Design an enzyme around this catalytic site. Structure first.
Site, PDB file in Angstrom:
ATOM      1  N   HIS A  74     -13.121 -48.112  14.911  1.00 43.31           N
ATOM      2  CA  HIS A  74     -12.069 -48.119  15.930  1.00 43.31           C
ATOM      3  C   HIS A  74     -10.866 -48.911  15.457  1.00 43.31           C
ATOM      4  O   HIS A  74     -10.975 -50.092  15.120  1.00 43.31           O
ATOM      5  CB  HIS A  74     -12.610 -48.621  17.279  1.00 43.31           C
ATOM      6  N   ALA A  75      -9.702 -48.259  15.473  1.00 43.47           N
ATOM      7  CA  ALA A  75      -8.462 -48.836  14.979  1.00 43.47           C
ATOM      8  C   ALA A  75      -8.002 -50.248  15.417  1.00 43.47           C
ATOM      9  O   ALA A  75      -7.647 -51.085  14.566  1.00 43.47           O
ATOM     10  CB  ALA A  75      -7.342 -47.817  15.137  1.00 43.47           C
ATOM     11  N   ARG A  76      -8.033 -50.532  16.722  1.00 40.80           N
ATOM     12  CA  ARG A  76      -7.593 -51.814  17.236  1.00 40.80           C
ATOM     13  C   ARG A  76      -8.506 -53.002  17.071  1.00 40.80           C
ATOM     14  O   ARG A  76      -8.091 -54.123  17.334  1.00 40.80           O
ATOM     15  CB  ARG A  76      -7.305 -51.659  18.708  1.00 40.80           C
ATOM     16  N   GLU A  77      -9.749 -52.780  16.656  1.00 39.66           N
ATOM     17  CA  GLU A  77     -10.744 -53.865  16.454  1.00 39.66           C
ATOM     18  C   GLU A  77     -10.618 -54.540  15.088  1.00 39.66           C
ATOM     19  O   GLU A  77     -11.553 -54.512  14.248  1.00 39.66           O
ATOM     20  CB  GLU A  77     -12.124 -53.276  16.604  1.00 39.66           C
TER      21      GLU A  77
ATOM     22  N   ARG B 141      -7.137 -46.562  19.242  1.00 43.73           N
ATOM     23  CA  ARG B 141      -8.575 -46.619  18.995  1.00 43.73           C
ATOM     24  C   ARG B 141      -9.120 -45.415  18.227  1.00 43.73           C
ATOM     25  O   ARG B 141      -9.938 -45.562  17.306  1.00 43.73           O
ATOM     26  CB  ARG B 141      -9.274 -46.732  20.372  1.00 43.73           C
TER      27      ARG B 141
ATOM     28  N   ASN C   5     -16.618 -42.756  17.478  1.00 45.18           N
ATOM     29  CA  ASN C   5     -17.951 -43.163  17.937  1.00 45.18           C
ATOM     30  C   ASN C   5     -18.474 -42.381  19.118  1.00 45.18           C
ATOM     31  O   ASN C   5     -19.325 -42.877  19.853  1.00 45.18           O
ATOM     32  CB  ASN C   5     -18.054 -44.644  18.229  1.00 45.18           C
ATOM     33  N   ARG C   6     -17.891 -41.205  19.337  1.00 45.95           N
ATOM     34  CA  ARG C   6     -18.298 -40.259  20.373  1.00 45.95           C
ATOM     35  C   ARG C   6     -18.388 -38.922  19.628  1.00 45.95           C
ATOM     36  O   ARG C   6     -18.577 -37.876  20.246  1.00 45.95           O
ATOM     37  CB  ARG C   6     -17.217 -40.094  21.454  1.00 45.95           C
TER      38      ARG C   6
ATOM     39  N   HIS D 151     -18.073 -53.651  15.109  1.00 43.88           N
ATOM     40  CA  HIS D 151     -17.034 -53.415  16.132  1.00 43.88           C
ATOM     41  C   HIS D 151     -16.643 -54.733  16.803  1.00 43.88           C
ATOM     42  O   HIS D 151     -17.121 -55.794  16.430  1.00 43.88           O
ATOM     43  CB  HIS D 151     -17.559 -52.487  17.262  1.00 43.88           C
ATOM     44  N   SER D 152     -15.775 -54.638  17.812  1.00 44.71           N
ATOM     45  CA  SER D 152     -15.369 -55.758  18.652  1.00 44.71           C
ATOM     46  C   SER D 152     -14.804 -55.118  19.930  1.00 44.71           C
ATOM     47  O   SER D 152     -14.590 -53.898  19.972  1.00 44.71           O
ATOM     48  CB  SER D 152     -14.348 -56.701  17.988  1.00 44.71           C
ATOM     49  N   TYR D 153     -14.806 -55.855  21.036  1.00 47.38           N
ATOM     50  CA  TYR D 153     -15.317 -57.218  21.125  1.00 47.38           C
ATOM     51  C   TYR D 153     -16.407 -57.166  22.208  1.00 47.38           C
ATOM     52  O   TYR D 153     -16.690 -56.080  22.737  1.00 47.38           O
ATOM     53  CB  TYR D 153     -14.203 -58.168  21.559  1.00 47.38           C
TER      54      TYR D 153
ATOM     55  N   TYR E 190     -23.235 -49.955  27.942  1.00 44.72           N
ATOM     56  CA  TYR E 190     -23.072 -48.790  28.831  1.00 44.72           C
ATOM     57  C   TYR E 190     -23.501 -47.564  28.063  1.00 44.72           C
ATOM     58  O   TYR E 190     -23.479 -47.567  26.824  1.00 44.72           O
ATOM     59  CB  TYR E 190     -21.619 -48.591  29.325  1.00 44.72           C
TER      60      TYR E 190
ATOM     61  N   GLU F 154     -20.825 -56.221  18.093  1.00 46.67           N
ATOM     62  CA  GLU F 154     -19.605 -56.353  18.870  1.00 46.67           C
ATOM     63  C   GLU F 154     -19.282 -57.817  18.676  1.00 46.67           C
ATOM     64  O   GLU F 154     -19.979 -58.680  19.198  1.00 46.67           O
ATOM     65  CB  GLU F 154     -19.879 -56.061  20.344  1.00 46.67           C
TER      66      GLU F 154
END
Ligand SMILES: N=C(N)NCCC[C@@H](CS)C(=O)O
Ligand SMILES: [Zn+2]
Length: 305
Positions: free
Chosen positions: A65-68, A123, A140-141, A193-195, A245, A267
């Site tokens: 994911h880009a923003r992490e 993301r 991730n989906r 990943h984060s967060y 989730y 995470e």
């Protein structure tokens, strides 16, 4: 463009680093590209370890994911540790002699570039979608793990778009292709990943538990205990669906269903105060405590081959 381990490095910097860290450590690191992104960037994979015949491996990626950003940062931190301590720290010397660490620095390169150039909170990938101007698929989906059944969207304009089909993205196809071509050696899959400060294991696409959920729970439990020993950082752990989730199509679930029994999603920091914009001042602390967790898991897997 100068690389720093306590700063977040842009893609051109990370790419330069993949080349330089490899050239300086020929006996420990080999670099390959396992495919290209939608925009033509090279998806690099570093093979860390003392070369030998028929070696088992642990596969770890960052930057899904880009923003992490703390994710990308960790893959680089990990590599310097491997090389500075090989020959000095008994465990790492033992890890590197016995197994090969497949480190994928950044999976979603086009999206990472986008967070550096236009939108910091991007993301998804940066591919185009038919019949719409909306861009990207949530990598991730996008894996074949109860694909798009739960916690995923069928709309390209959403942040959790599952794609036109499983592995529609060149990046997830490339990663999936590599794992499939190396099932025999790969013993553990780790995806950073984060967060939130959590360590998740299967399953997220469902509430059903893996056969070895008992072991994975104990392992995860021990790893978080380990992480907390440095700065007191509290992590939670458990099966994704019920711990974070339900969400279909994650690589952790997919890899597990490929036969890879130790499959975890990390995470990292923090719990929401800075969120994805985790300051650079927290890079070493985060990476240091995370190393303990990854090393704990590494020793365990090695001792459970
Ligand atoms: N949900 C799965 N399959 N695994 C755990 C990852 C949860 C989260 C990471 S940002 C996400 O991808 O949304
Ligand atoms: Zn993520």
């Amino acid at each position: 463009t100068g690389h720093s381990y306590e700063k977040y490095n842009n893609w051109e910097t990370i790419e330069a680093w993949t080349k330089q860290v490899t050239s300086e450590n020929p006996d420990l690191i080999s670099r390959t590209a396992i495919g290209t992104t939608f925009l033509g960037n090279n998806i690099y994979l570093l093979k860390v370890g003392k070369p030998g015949p028929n070696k088992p491996a642990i596969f770890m990626d960052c930057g899904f994911h880009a923003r992490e950003w703390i994710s990308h940062a960790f893959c680089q931190w990990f590599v310097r540790e491997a090389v500075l301590t090989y020959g000095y720290e008994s465990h790492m010397t033992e890890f590197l002699n016995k197994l090969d660490f497949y480190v994928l620095p950044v999976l979603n390169i086009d999206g990472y570039i986008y967070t550096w150039t236009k939108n910091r909170m991007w993301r998804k990938t940066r591919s185009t979608n038919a019949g719409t101007t909306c861009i990207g698929t949530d990598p991730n989906r996008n894996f074949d793990a109860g694909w798009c059944t739960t916690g995923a969207s069928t709309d390209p304009c959403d942040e959790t778009y599952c794609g036109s089909a499983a592995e529609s993205e060149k990046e997830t196809k490339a990663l999936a292709d590599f794992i499939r071509n190396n099932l025999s050696s790969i013993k553990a899959y780790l995806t950073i990943h984060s967060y939130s400060q959590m360590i998740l294991y299967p399953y997220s696409y469902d509430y059903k538990l893996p056969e070895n959920n008992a072991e994975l729970n104990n392992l995860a439990k021990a790893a978080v205990k380990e992480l907390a020993t440095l700065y007191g950082t509290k992590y939670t752990y458990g099966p994704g669906a019920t711990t974070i989730y339900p969400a279909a199509g994650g690589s952790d679930d997919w890899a597990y269903d490929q036969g890879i029994k130790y499959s975890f999603t990390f995470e990292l920091r923090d719990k929401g105060r800075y969120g994805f914009i985790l300051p650079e001042s927290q890079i070493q602390a985060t990476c240091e405590e995370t190393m303990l967790a990854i090393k704990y898991v590494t020793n365990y897997v090695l001792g459970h081959l």
